[PDB]
Design a protein around this ligand. Structure first.
Ligand SMILES: CC(C)CCN1c2nc(Nc3cc(F)c(O)c(F)c3)ncc2N(C)C(=O)[C@H]1C
Ligand SMILES: CC(C)CCN1c2nc(Nc3cc(F)c(O)c(F)c3)ncc2N(C)C(=O)[C@H]1C
Lengths: 297, 297
């Protein structure tokens, strides 16, 4: 009874069904990056209980996002199920009922930026064999329900689908002060920021190897982002306390890192980059971002 | 690679999938008779191998035809399979790959006439509990593929889906002479007419009970048709010779009648009304049709 949501589920369902009939080659062609499919639905005096009467669904570059899903080790049928077997839950983003995917509303500006970087982004994912801390983009759509038009993007959840998170940080490593809201603090899991970290002595206990890998990854990802003139992105950090609610599937919870053996508490960390689509400058912003994360880890 | 056909299969598939999610009540409402659903599809640089790039599919009164299918003992999933698991074959009509259904192209005039009689037709099917020799109408659609627009209707095949037919008649019982074509005679199974019957001494060997039932049915059906100002319909007659290519399923081959015990050859007969949608007069045409069939049976 959120009509936009049901158009989305209807849309995702339809999309994966269509693709199931398409022969998938190993390569994308340049045209695949300029492609889309539109479906306009008009129901007159029919099917009122489920669908809206007049709606639209547009999918951008279905072949590119098909290719990306598989490269991120996501199967189309599983993806469909996660988005359609039961509604996504709100909170401003939605998360799939099974906590695997994030569904964020974006602007037409963002859609244009995505289209602008999609080839280079795709090529990046090829080179690093899908091993990255960048947002994993899984699908991009336009929804129309009688007058209202929204754009959405789908990504992999940085947090675990099983193991709960008792503390979140959103780090940018900026010179201007960043601190969390008192209004947000009241919510079950607040969204702490650079100084809630730098102030309240938060430590991330990972071993020297896990840290070396992570920072090497982070370095390449961030340089790629700067080179695209992208900035204002964050590192999302999630802490799972084993001794409250802790063995994860690193093939589903791909962003997990176990704490080292001498850690004060049994912890799992979930860390990746989020919010890349905004296009003082990009170049130094990345270095300033990389300096910060080095210091806190 | 007949694009209109693939739009039809695509369309039928989509339609039954949508309906599978609709809660079906025991009754139709008046609005159900005025209802439709349109789907417009635009593929830009995508999915070229299967679907056309720009197509439309409109289904008339989906709830009415859903109700009719079930009343004719056809399950939606089976119906979908018959129309979609493999292409329909031509010959001007198409027949489903499994020989269960006929797909005929009709005019917008015919579609308007169907809409005009649909409530009364439906009510008729309720009263006779679906036991009739009338065309069983299972679905009605509009297809658009880049410029061309066709209307189709789907019916149950009068002939058997298993047992072959070596002789067909098309009887109207008209005063003006009717005889088959020499050009058609050359084809494997010609389409004989009133005088090919009345001339070449053709007999239909059914027992006095089967004949009584049939004619009683035929009487009600035909009166109903006349009362709707419909005429120019025919009795399609199909003879299966057991001793050439004969036990049928009367729940799939619903129009079958076994020959009586003293019949010169082991025969099965398939007889029903076809071609009702044309709107010297209707009233006597029916009586003249009923006179004829009485005499030949
Ligand atoms: C709200 C903002 C700051 C985060 C939005 N965001 C993401 N969010 C999550 N999971 C997530 C889960 C939570 F339980 C939660 O409280 C939270 F804050 C975030 N995964 C991936 C992304 N990716 C890749 C992103 O680009 C953007 C879209
Ligand atoms: C071509 C004309 C005269 C028949 C078309 N027709 C039907 N045809 C068939 N099966 C059929 C099968 C054959 F193998 C065949 O050679 C043939 F002639 C007809 N069943 C039901 C209908 N119904 C109900 C009809 O209203 C109309 C649409």
């Amino acid at each position: 009874s959120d009509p936009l949501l049901s158009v989305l589920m209807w849309g995702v369902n339809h999309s994966i069904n269509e693709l199931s009939h398409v022969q998938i080659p190993v390569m994308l062609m340049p045209d695949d990056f300029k492609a889309y499919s539109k479906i306009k639905v008009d129901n007159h005096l029919f099917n009122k209980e489920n669908m809206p009467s007049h709606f639209k669904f547009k999918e951008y570059c279905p072949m590119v996002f098909r290719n990306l899903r598989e490269r991120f080790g996501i199967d189309d049928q599983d993806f469909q199920n996660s988005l359609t077997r039961s509604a996504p839950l709100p909170n401003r983003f939605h998360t799939s009922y099974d906590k695997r995917y994030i569904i964020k509303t974006i602007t037409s500006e963002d859609v244009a930026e995505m289209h602008n970087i999609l080839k280079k982004y795709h090529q990046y994912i090829v080179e690093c064999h899908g091993i990255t801390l960048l947002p994993q983009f899984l699908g991009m759509y336009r929804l129309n329900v009688d007058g209202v038009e929204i754009y959405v993007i789908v990504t992999r959840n940085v947090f675990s689908h099983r193991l709960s998170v008792y503390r979140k940080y959103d780090l940018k490593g900026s010179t201007v002060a960043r601190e969390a809201s008192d209004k947000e603090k009241a919510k079950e899991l607040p969204t702490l920021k650079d100084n809630d970290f730098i102030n309240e002595g938060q430590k991330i206990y990972i071993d020297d190897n896990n840290k070396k890998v992570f920072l090497e990854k982070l370095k390449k990802d961030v340089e790629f982002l700067a080179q695209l003139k992208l900035m204002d992105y964050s590192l999302l950090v999630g802490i799972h306390d084993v001794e409250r609610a802790g063995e994860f599937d690193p093939n589903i919870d791909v962003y997990g890192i176990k704490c080292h053996e001498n850690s004060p508490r049994k912890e799992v960390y979930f860390m990746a980059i989020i919010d890349i689509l905004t296009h003082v400058n990009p170049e130094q912003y990345s270095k300033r971002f990389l300096d910060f994360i080095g210091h806190i880890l």
